[PDB]
Amino acid sequence: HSVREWVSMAGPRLEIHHRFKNFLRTHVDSHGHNVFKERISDMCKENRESLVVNYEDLAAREHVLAYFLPEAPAELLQIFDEAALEVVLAMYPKYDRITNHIHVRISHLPLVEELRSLRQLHLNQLIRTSGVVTSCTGVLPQLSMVKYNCNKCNFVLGPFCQSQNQEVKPGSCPECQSAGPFEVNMEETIYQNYQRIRIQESPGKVAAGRLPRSKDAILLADLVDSCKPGDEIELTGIYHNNYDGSLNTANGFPVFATVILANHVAKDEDVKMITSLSKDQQIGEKIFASIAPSIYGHEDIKRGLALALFGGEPKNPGGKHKVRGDINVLLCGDPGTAKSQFLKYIEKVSSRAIFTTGQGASAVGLTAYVQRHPVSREWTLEAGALVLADRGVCLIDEFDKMNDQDRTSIHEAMEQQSISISKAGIVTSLQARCTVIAAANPIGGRYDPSLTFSENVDLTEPIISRFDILCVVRDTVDPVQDEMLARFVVGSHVRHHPSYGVEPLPQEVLKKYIIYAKERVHPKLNQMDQDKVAKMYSDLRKESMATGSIPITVRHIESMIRMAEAHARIHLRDYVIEDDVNMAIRVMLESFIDTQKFSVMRSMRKTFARYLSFRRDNNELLLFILKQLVAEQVTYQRNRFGAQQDTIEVPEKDLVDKARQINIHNLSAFYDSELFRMNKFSHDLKRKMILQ
DNA sequence: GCATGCATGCGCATGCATGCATTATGCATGCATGCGCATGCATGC
DNA sequence: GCATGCATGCGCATGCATGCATAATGCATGCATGCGCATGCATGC
Ligand SMILES: Nc1ncnc2c1ncn2[C@@H]1O[C@H](COP(=O)(O)OP(=O)(O)OP(=O)(O)O)[C@@H](O)[C@H]1O
Ligand SMILES: [Mg+2]
Ligand SMILES: [Zn+2]
Numbered sequence: 001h002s003v004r005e006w007v008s009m010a011g012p013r014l015e016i017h018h019r020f021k022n023f024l025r026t027h028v029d030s031h032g033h034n035v036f037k038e039r040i041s042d043m044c045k046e047n048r049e050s051l052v053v054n055y056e057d058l059a060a061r062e063h064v065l066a067y068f069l070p071e072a073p074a075e076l077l078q079i080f081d082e083a084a085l086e087v088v089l090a091m092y093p094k095y096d097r098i099t100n101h102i103h104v105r106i107s108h109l110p111l112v113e114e115l116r117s118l119r120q121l122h123l124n125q126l127i128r129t130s131g132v133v134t135s136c137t138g139v140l141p142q143l144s145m146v147k148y149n150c151n152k153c154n155f156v157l158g159p160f161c162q163s164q165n166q167e168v169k170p171g172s173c174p175e176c177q178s179a180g181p182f183e184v185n186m187e188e189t190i191y192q193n194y195q196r197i198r199i200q201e202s203p204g205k206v207a208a209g210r211l212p213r214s215k216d217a218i219l220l221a222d223l224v225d226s227c228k229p230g231d232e233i234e235l236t237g238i239y240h241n242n243y244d245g246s247l248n249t250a251n252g253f254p255v256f257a258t259v260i261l262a263n264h265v266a267k268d269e270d271v272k273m274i275t276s277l278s279k280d281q282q283i284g285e286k287i288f289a290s291i292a293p294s295i296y297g298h299e300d301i302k303r304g305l306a307l308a309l310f311g312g313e314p315k316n317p318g319g320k321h322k323v324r325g326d327i328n329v330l331l332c333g334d335p336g337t338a339k340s341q342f343l344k345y346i347e348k349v350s351s352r353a354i355f356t357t358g359q360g361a362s363a364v365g366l367t368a369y370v371q372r373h374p375v376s377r378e379w380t381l382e383a384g385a386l387v388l389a390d391r392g393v394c395l396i397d398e399f400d401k402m403n404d405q406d407r408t409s410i411h412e413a414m415e416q417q418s419i420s421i422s423k424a425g426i427v428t429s430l431q432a433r434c435t436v437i438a439a440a441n442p443i444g445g446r447y448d449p450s451l452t453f454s455e456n457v458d459l460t461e462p463i464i465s466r467f468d469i470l471c472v473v474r475d476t477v478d479p480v481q482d483e484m485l486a487r488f489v490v491g492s493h494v495r496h497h498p499s500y501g502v503e504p505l506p507q508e509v510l511k512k513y514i515i516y517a518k519e520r521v522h523p524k525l526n527q528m529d530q531d532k533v534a535k536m537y538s539d540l541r542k543e544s545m546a547t548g549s550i551p552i553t554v555r556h557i558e559s560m561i562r563m564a565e566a567h568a569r570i571h572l573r574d575y576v577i578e579d580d581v582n583m584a585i586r587v588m589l590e591s592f593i594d595t596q597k598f599s600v601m602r603s604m605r606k607t608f609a610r611y612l613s614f615r616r617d618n619n620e621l622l623l624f625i626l627k628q629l630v631a632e633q634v635t636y637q638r639n640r641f642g643a644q645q646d647t648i649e650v651p652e653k654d655l656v657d658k659a660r661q662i663n664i665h666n667l668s669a670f671y672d673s674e675l676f677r678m679n680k681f682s683h684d685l686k687r688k689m690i691l692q
Numbered sequence: 693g694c695a696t697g698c699a700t701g702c703g704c705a706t707g708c709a710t711g712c713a714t715t716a717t718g719c720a721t722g723c724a725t726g727c728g729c730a731t732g733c734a735t736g737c
Numbered sequence: 738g739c740a741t742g743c744a745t746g747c748g749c750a751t752g753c754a755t756g757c758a759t760a761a762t763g764c765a766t767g768c769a770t771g772c773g774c775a776t777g778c779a780t781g782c
Binding site for chain 1: 717
């Protein structure tokens with residue numbers, strides 16, 4: 001006889017029920033503790049409805065049930081549910097008021113083949129698969145214990161159990177003996193949670209030359225909404241045919257359709273630690289060095305992205321004057337400078353970050369529209385990436401390639417911080433409180449130092465004016481820097497084969513610190529110094545007009561304040577002090593100067609050396625001087641000789657003179673500094689020379 | 693005139709032609725709209 | 738004038754409300770007449 005035939009009869013049913021009850025009551029762990037005791041207790045503490053059982057323990061304790069389990073799942077699961085309900089109701093008597101049924105789910109199993117191997121042999125069996133979710137139908141109320149109203153009299157027919165295979169068709173009304181019709185009593189019916197899922201093979205495991213295959217699954221009761229589309233899951237289920245409509249009859253061959261019915265899915269002190277890290281005096285440098293571990297160099301960009309991530313504070317006196325606190329970032333770089341890796345890292349770190357590209361065929365669009373979704377076939381209003389990132393970050397790649405509509409939408413979202421829609425009878429305004437970070441390339445493919453930033457970029461001045469921070473990444477042949485970058489790249493390639501800052505914080509710790517600072521830190525400007533700010537602003541405007549190009553405006557000051565707030569948010573300071581103000585001054589001055597052309601940039605850099613030297617390193621400046629002299633000598637050698645020489649040498653007197661011009665008189669510490677050795681410089685006193 | 697016979701008369705059973713009562717479910721068709729395609733018009737540079 | 742963008746345009750699939758097609762058997766009632774009974778009329782002797 002078949003396994004299910006022996007299962008059906010009452011004798012072994014009751015015997016197996018008693019065996020399972022004893023297994024539940026007597027099962028203990030490897031340490032002697034009653035597993036089901038603690039399990040049912042923690043289930044009781046939250047009023048849950050499901051119980052989890054391992055096939056390994058079930059096979060170890062009672063082998064016959066484990067053997068019969070794969071080839072007769074439905075009846076055995078029903079018996080186990082009855083036994084578990086009896087045991088639980090014995091433990092606690094109140095569930096008759098709360099929950100009248102408890103489900104039993106199998107957790108572990110011997111792994112079963114993938115979606116390709118499922119064939120006729122696996123029908124009506126227990127299987128376990130792994131796949132990727134592609135769609136979900138939501139939550140649906142299915143019938144259970146249906147009550148029907150007669151339509152001739154008004155009698156209420158008793159509850160009928162709704163099986164998953166066929167619909168319930170009542171025979172006749174017990175009183176008037178009518179044959180129909182009947183309708184469902186909506187008020188007295190009981191309902192169940194139902195959801196449908198489509199699963200596709202993981203693209204990495206598909207052999208070359210064939211395509212991934214998909215199958216459908218059904219989740220019920222507590223399993224609903226346990227998976228998001230695009231995730232990777234593992235199911236334990238029943239491979240089924242016996243549902244009405246599976247046979248193809250209207251035309252074609254007699255082909256059956258298969259469906260899987262699933263029953264399991266397998267995918268305080270921190271505040272004190274945050275405060276302790278804040279107590280450390282150099283937390284700011286730790287955070288600055290913690291950004292983008294995989295990218296070498298570009299320390300200024302990481303420092304700016306720190307403020308961009310931490311953000312500021314909006315201010316709106318009354319309902320009249322709105323001032324944002326989001327610090328936008330724009331990057332312009334020559335090819336090969338890894339602009340996109342920064343955006344990828346930011347998306348990885350940020351809790352809510354949206355990524356899109358202006359070139360085309362983006363997964364998420366940049367404009368709101370109303371459409372019937374291709375997958376769910378529903379009439380939806382799909383807002384752009386700007387709307388979806390409320391209090392989040394929006395990332396745009398290939399900023400220049402955007403067409404007219406994208407530029408218009410971005411301008412509207414940046415200047416008004418709201419998106420207006422008038423389409424298909426729908427008129428709306430949606431909030432776009434988001435921070436914008438963008439990357440782009442110059443017009444000719446290479447940055448021109450003799451032209452302004454606006455002349456080098458395809459964008460317009462109004463769009464550029466919105467961004468608080470502008471960064472320029474220019475590629476220049478430095479042998480030592482190129483050597484280090486190549487070393488890092490080759491090391492990364494070798495490592496991933498299949499066979500200044502003391503210590504950066506952990507990524508999860510950084511996330512927790514960011515969340516805590518955003519939630520509970522609100523620095524106050526009650527200690528600002530207006531005299532110094534006003535004097536510096538006046539002097540900056542004066543010398544900008546003296547040079548005669550791109551004068552400063554009040555907007556920059558606002559950015560400074562925001563940056564100051566961001567810095568005060570880094571140290572968990574509740575009040576703004578002079579250090580944050582000076583750092584924001586340095587950042588704003590660097591951003592403003594870097595956008596000028598050669599002569600103006602040089603003059604401004606020379607004149608404003610006082611402010612730009614805040615918390616700077618003298619050794620770095622001396623290294624810059626040495627690099628400039630080395631570059632001059634190398635250029636002269638290449639132009640005259642026609643080829644480079646084997647050695648580079650430079651007198652110490654020129655370096656000393658330039659340091660005196662910058663008011664530096666001692667260089668022994670620079671000689672003993674690590675920066676001197678890192679660039680493979682040497683100093684010879686026998687000739688008073690520097691060799692590289 | 694009294695004794696007897698008896699053709700008439702009445703009520704309840706069965707047999708047989710007409711007549712009376714009952715009664716939801718499953719399958720097919722046209723309207724709306726997505727998706728791939730080629731022609732063609734209009735707009736730049 | 739030639740190169741490119743693109744709003745308009747067309748044909749065949751599915752999904753969903755209305756609409757279309759099907760289709761004898763069993764049980765009840767009144768008319769005709771047999772069978773037992775008591776009254777009553779008519780006819781003998
Ligand atoms: N400093 C760096 N550290 C690590 N990798 C780098 C660095 N600079 C460049 N790369 C590598 O250079 C490659 C160039 O690709 P990438 O997408 O990063 O370029 P991009 O700057 O976005 O260029 P494009 O202007 O073409 O969009 C990448 O594989 C990146 O890892
Ligand atoms: Mg890129
Ligand atoms: Zn009824």
